Amino acid sequence: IAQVQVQNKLQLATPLLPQEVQRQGIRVTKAVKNFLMVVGVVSTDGSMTK
Amino acid sequence: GSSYVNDFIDRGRVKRVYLQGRPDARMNPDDLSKWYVRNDKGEMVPFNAFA
Secondary structure, three states, X not given: OHHHHHHHHHHHHOOOOOHHHHHHOOOOXXXXXXXXXXXXXXXXXXXXXX | OOOOOOEEEOOOOEEEXXXXXXXXXXXXXXXXXXXXXXXXXXXXXXXXXXX
């Protein structure tokens, strides 16, 4: 319901924003400070690049 | 009628840009014949010629 209230007031915020900020679309996400786990892949043979 | 063209920054805050005709050039039905519309050949066409 906090996300609900945030993107309720963001709807009133969006008309004074520029046209391009309106055509692009802005996103609302619940923020978590820490990183749980980094999952990454490497290249053993040195063949495929970054 | 007016028309929202685009925005402009003013005092570090976003405001918009409208454009109309002058306040003394749309008041009467006779003042709606001043507005000229461009022909494809180049010259101007009056507005009480057709409308």
